[PDB]
Amino acid sequence: ATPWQKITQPVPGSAQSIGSFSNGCIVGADTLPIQSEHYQVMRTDQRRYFGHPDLVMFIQRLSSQVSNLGMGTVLIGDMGMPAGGRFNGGHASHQTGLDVDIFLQLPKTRWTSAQLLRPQALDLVSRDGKHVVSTLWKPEIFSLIKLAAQDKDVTRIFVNPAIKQQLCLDAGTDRDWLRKVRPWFQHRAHMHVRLRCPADSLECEDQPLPPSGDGCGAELQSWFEPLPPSCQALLDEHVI
Amino acid sequence: WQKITQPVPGSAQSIGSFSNGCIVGADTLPIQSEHYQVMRTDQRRYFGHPDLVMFIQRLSSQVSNLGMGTVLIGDMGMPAGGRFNGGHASHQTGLDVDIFLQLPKTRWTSAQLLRPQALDLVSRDGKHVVSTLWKPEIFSLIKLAAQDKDVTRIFVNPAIKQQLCLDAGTDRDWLRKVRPWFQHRAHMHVRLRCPADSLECEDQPLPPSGDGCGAELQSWFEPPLPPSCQALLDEH
């Protein structure tokens, strides 16, 4: 285990996302409040409910919007570890406090602590991967994803290609936000939301914009065929 | 109607409805063009209203000169229109045309045109287009047809409409003209409005409002002969 995987408390300091989403860290990370009227937090035993203040604010804003549209409870998965860095177990992003997984269910009855520790995913996609399951696809999930994508701090939302396909069909005229939706493997039961580098995180590295347009055509069809010096310095000064 | 082998002399007039009518003064689609070829000419079903001929000519020159291949024209109608002995419910008034959803990059031979080989663009289960066969040139063929001011409807398999809904981007209004129907996996059926100088042609109402990429599309993945037409038959 790396020091990043063992630390239990954020590094004190002005909030700073340092490096790139898949090679970085964060100083001064905020903690997502566990108690909220609008969302609940899955798998808190992992201690991955930390991130940039912008990420916490985003979760709070999105969840308030969802609640005010009369929808159910937003379910929050992995943000990042207290000082960011690479997880032990799975994906390599979520290193700079700007990535969050959100389950694509909005339960009308809040989940228990046991349900939150061992969450039961709902696959929204057909076995062959070609389309969403029509009896599971809900306008509320379209709205959850669209509300996230229209937020100015969001750059990308990774979802299964079948899910982007349905979003594409449902969007109508107000569809520019689809550009932020990026097809990826899996992501049948959760979306992965990514925010832009915070304005004052000078050592944070942004990605280029996605390809132009909604992305609902050729690109979608094709889917159906060492640390940054300032992070290393935290180790050299013995802070992780 | 099979027995009238040449267009009836007179000013061009589409008479009656698409599935119960005929045409006086039908134009003939020229068999020879650099922009399109005519399938099954042995059946002698390349006749229709001047507006249909002109539509085929301008669609085809746009498609061909965009470098997307030449167009393959199927049935228009008989020389005086009228009901078919089989296959077609419509194509009686000179305002319907079948067009194959293949754009040959070199001209088909006479034998290929006489016995045309369809290319099924749709999956076996009907739920999507075949990912390796759907191409931007076919999107463009259908879009250019649908954006034509004289066209009212284009019938295609629901999987094809779904794909057009995905490809259209922000320039979408023409999607309303595209109507899902059974089959139509290898051809589109284009329909034109009644000509502006029509005397007794019957139009259909507009399609349902909107692009049609929502609930209607989703649901697919679950009178006597007009007197002028009788007079044509009587005159033999």
UniProtKB/Swiss-Prot annotation, chain A:
The keyword Zinc applies. This is Penicillin-insensitive murein endopeptidase. It is an enzyme of class 3 (hydrolase). Its main location: periplasm. GO terms for biological process: peptidoglycan biosynthetic process; peptidoglycan metabolic process; proteolysis; response to xenobiotic stimulus. Belongs to the peptidase M74 family. NCBIfam families: PRK09429.1. Residues 209-240 are annotated as: Disordered. Gene3D superfamilies: 3.30.1380.10. Binds 2 Zn(2+) ions per subunit. Zn(2+) ion 1 is bound in the active site. Zn(2+) ion 2 is bound at the dimer interface by residues from both subunits. Its cofactor is Zn(2+). Optimum pH is 5-8. One of its GO terms (molecular function) is peptidase activity. Changing D101A: Strongly reduces enzyme activity.
From Swiss-Prot, chain B:
In E.coli there are three murein endopeptidases: two are penicillin sensitive (DacB and PbpG), the other (MepA) not. Coiled coil: none annotated. Zn(2+) 2 binds at D125, H128. This is Penicillin-insensitive murein endopeptidase. Belongs to the peptidase M74 family. The gene is mepA. Murein endopeptidase that cleaves the D-alanyl-meso-2,6-diamino-pimelyl amide bond that connects peptidoglycan strands. Likely plays a role in the removal of murein from the sacculus and could also play a role in the integration of nascent murein strands into the sacculus. Binds 2 Zn(2+) ions per subunit. Zn(2+) ion 1 is bound in the active site. Zn(2+) ion 2 is bound at the dimer interface by residues from both subunits. GO terms for molecular function: endopeptidase activity; metal ion binding; metalloendopeptidase activity; peptidase activity; serine-type endopeptidase activity. The keyword Iron does not apply. Disulfide bonds join C22-C229, C165-C213, C194-C201. It comes from Escherichia coli (strain K12).
